[PDB]
Amino acid sequence: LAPANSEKIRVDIWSDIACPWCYIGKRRFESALGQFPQRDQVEVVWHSFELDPSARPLNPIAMRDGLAMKYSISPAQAQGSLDHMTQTAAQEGLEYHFDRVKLANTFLAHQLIHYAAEQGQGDAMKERLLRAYMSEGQNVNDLDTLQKLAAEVGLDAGAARAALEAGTYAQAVRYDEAQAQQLGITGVPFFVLGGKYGVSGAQAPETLLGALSQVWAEQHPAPLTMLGQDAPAEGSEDGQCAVPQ
Amino acid sequence: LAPANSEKIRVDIWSDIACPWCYIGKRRFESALGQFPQRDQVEVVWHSFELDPSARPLNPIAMRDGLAMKYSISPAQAQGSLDHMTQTAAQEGLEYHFDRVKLANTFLAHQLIHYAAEQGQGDAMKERLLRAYMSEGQNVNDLDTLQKLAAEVGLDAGAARAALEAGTYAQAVRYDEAQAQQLGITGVPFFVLGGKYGVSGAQAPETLLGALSQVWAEQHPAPLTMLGQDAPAEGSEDGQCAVPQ
């Protein structure tokens, strides 16, 4: 989890397309980054996460009922979360329609994001899939649908669908998920900063900005004022006579 | 003859108000300076010089005859120099009228330049006096005239005349002249650059620019590329162990 460039700080993010807090979290992270003076020095690495890797391809029940059954809570509790997430999302410029949500297995969707990332379109693909899931009632387990969404993002639709059908990025997705399991990440969005600090959930942009700033200040403190004269290192049996100063 | 600031190069100039080549030389030095990239790093120090410190206050003969008698040359030789100087001066934007020149002792004029220099007006006073001598037929030994010229430059005319009458700057002028005699300077204009190099006479702006450039390159060479690691100096019985690099 080290940055490719030494001068920079790295942020690793785990996220599932099926999680409304991940879209909210994306917007809040983007806000934080926008306010971070050293944003250009940030390497962001996104990772696939499945809330339920064994989820059936499509569960045709209403999202409220899926939530209630998954979390062992009442339909009323579930609706409460749905309404809260919808209201919170509106403040991030997100208009959700949970009444249309298709409870789909997101494994192929994650593979499509990996394909897109190889074409320089990882973020656009992610954003498109989050919108398709949360607002447009699209089934992101459906290959027709995934291919269409890839086309809308500007990808080679035939090539994208071939990659999905071949399972080209299946291993990469499982690898992302394995990493999260090893780090003890059991919910999303999850941010790792500087390979050291964790932030759990879609916290405020102020909090993410604070983490960025803190990590930056730690890894790049103000340089010391050096006194005296730096000692010669081993191998330097040398000397000079200097002029009176 | 060292510069007040270490970062800079110093040019010392000796000059007499009575010498037409000094006005020409002033213009040519100014041209050179204008073309010198590091002109702001040049400290110019001007010094009084009298061609003839024992010259009578005013010698009423024509400049041609004064020249002929001084240099032991014919009137024709003298007129030849006059015409040549006049033609050369025109190319520097100087319109001479040697037919009007008053052959005056220049000691007081030099004192006035020193007074003016203390008021931040040394150059303007010099320029005014050169013009008065070479073109306007003014007697620069005459106190009325000197006071008037000081007033035209913007000085306190009463204060300037009082300084002349008191002989306040007489010693300073003699000191300038002594320095020239010690350096073996026997004609003007004379330039000393970097306290080391002499340029005799009103040479071309190209030559003065070349001298400036040469002196600059000598005193400020391009820094060396250091190899290895600078040796510790006496008093530094020290060491550290450094990480593998």
Nearest to A239 among B232, B240, B242 (CB): B232
Resolution expressed in Å: 1.8
The yes or no reply on domain B1-245 and CATH 3.20.20.70 is no
Where are chain B's structural domains?
A: 1-245
B239 in contact with chain A, both atoms CB, cutoff 8 A: yes
Tell if the CB–CB gap between B242 and A232 is shorter than 8 Å: no
- Interface check for B243 against chain A (CB to CB < 8 A): the answer is no
CB B36 within 8 A of CB B28: no
Residues of chain A with C-beta less than 8 angstroms from the C-beta of B231: 232, 236, 238-240
Distance from CA of A233 to the nearest CA of B (A): 5
Q: Please count the CA atoms within 13 angstroms of the CA of B116 that sit on its side-chain side.
A: 26
Strand partners, B191: B13, B199
Beta pairing, strands B9-15 & A58-59: unpaired
Residue closest to B127 by CA, chosen among B150, B107, B111, B158: B150
| Rounded Cα distance, B142 and B165, in Å | 11
Question: Which candidate from B231, B240, B242 shows the least CB-CB separation from A239?
Answer: B231
> SS3 letters for chain B?
CCCCCCCCEEEEEEECCCCHHHHHHHHHHHHHHHHCCCHHHEEEEEEECCCCCCCCCEECCCHHHHHHHHHCCCHHHHHHHHHHHHHHHHCCCCCCCHHHCCEECCHHHHHHHHHHHHCCCHHHHHHHHHHHHHCCCCCCCCHHHHHHHHHHHCCCHHHHHHHHHHCCCHHHHHHHHHHHHHCCCCCCCEEEECCCEEEECCCCHHHHHHHHHHHHHHHCCCCCCCCCCCCCECCCCCCECCCCC
Residue A238 sits at the chain B interface (C-beta within 8 Å): yes
Min Cα–Cα distance to chain A from B192, Å: 29
Distances from the Cα of B16 to the Cα of A108, B45, B59, B131, angstroms: 95, 14, 17, 13
Chain A residues near residue B240 by CB distance under 8 angstroms: 230-234
Q: Is any Cβ of chain A less than 8 angstroms from the Cβ of B231?
A: yes
Chain-chain contact of B231 with A236 (C-beta, under 8 angstroms) = yes
Residue recorded with tokens 């669908």: A161
> Is the minimum CB–CB distance between A72 and chain B shorter than 8 Å?
no
For residue B227, give how far its alpha carbon lies from the nearest alpha carbon of chain A (Å). Answer: 14
Token digits of residue B229:
């690691």
Tell me whether A226 touches chain B (CB under 8 Å).
no
Contact A28, A204 (CB under 8 A): yes
Scored b (16 or more CB within 10 A) or e, B17-44 reads bbbbbbbbbbbbbebbbeebeeeebbee
Q: Is any Cβ of chain A less than 8 angstroms from the Cβ of B240?
A: yes
Q: How far apart are CA A44 and CA B139, in angstroms?
A: 84
Nearest neighbour of B240 by CB, restricted to A231, A239, A240: A231
Contacts of residue A129, defined as CB under 8 A and 6 or more positions apart, other chains included, come to A17, A109, A112, A113, A140, A149
Q: Which of A92-103 are b and which e, b meaning 16 or more Cβ less than 10 Å from the residue's Cβ?
A: bebebebeebbb
B2 touches chain A (CB under 8 A): no
User: What is the maximum alpha-carbon separation in chain B?
Assistant: 88
Q: Which of A6, A8, A50 is nearest to A212 (CA)?
A: A8
Say whether B234 and A239 touch across the interface (CB within 8 A). Answer: yes
> Measured between CB atoms, does A234 come within 8 Å of chain B?
yes
Task: Report the candidate in A189, A91, A103, A195 with the shortest Cα–Cα distance to residue A141.
Answer: A103
- Closest by CA position to B55, among listed B131, B176, B149, B141: B141
State how far residue B6 is from chain A, nearest Cα, in angstroms.
Answer: 16
Instruction: Tell me how far apart the alpha carbons of residues B40 and B159 are, in angstroms, rounded to a whole number.
Output: 32
What count of other Cβ atoms lies within 10 Å of the Cβ of residue A87? 10
User: B241 to chain A: which residues are within 8 Å by CB?
Assistant: 233-234
Å between B231 CA and nearest CA of chain A: 5
| Burial (Cβ within 10 Å: 0-12, 13-18, ≥19) of residue B173 | buried
Task: Tell which residue, A164, A190, A165, A166, has the closest CA to residue A176.
Answer: A190
The total number of residues shown for chain A amounts to: 245
Three state DSSP letters for chain A: CCCCCCCCEEEEEEECCCCHHHHHHHHHHHHHHHHCCCHHHEEEEEEECCCCCCCCCEECCCHHHHHHHHHCCCHHHHHHHHHHHHHHHHCCCCCCCHHHCCEECCHHHHHHHHHHHHCCCHHHHHHHHHHHHHCCCCCCCCHHHHHHHHHHHCCCHHHHHHHHHHCCCHHHHHHHHHHHHHCCCCCCCEEEECCCEEEECCCCHHHHHHHHHHHHHHHCCCCCCCCCCCCCECCCCCCECCCCC
Structure tokens at A103: 């409870």
Rounded to 5 degrees, φ, ψ at B29 are -65, -40
Which residue of chain A is at minimal alpha-carbon distance from B238?
A: A231
Nearest residue, CB atoms, B233 vs list A233, A234, A242: A242
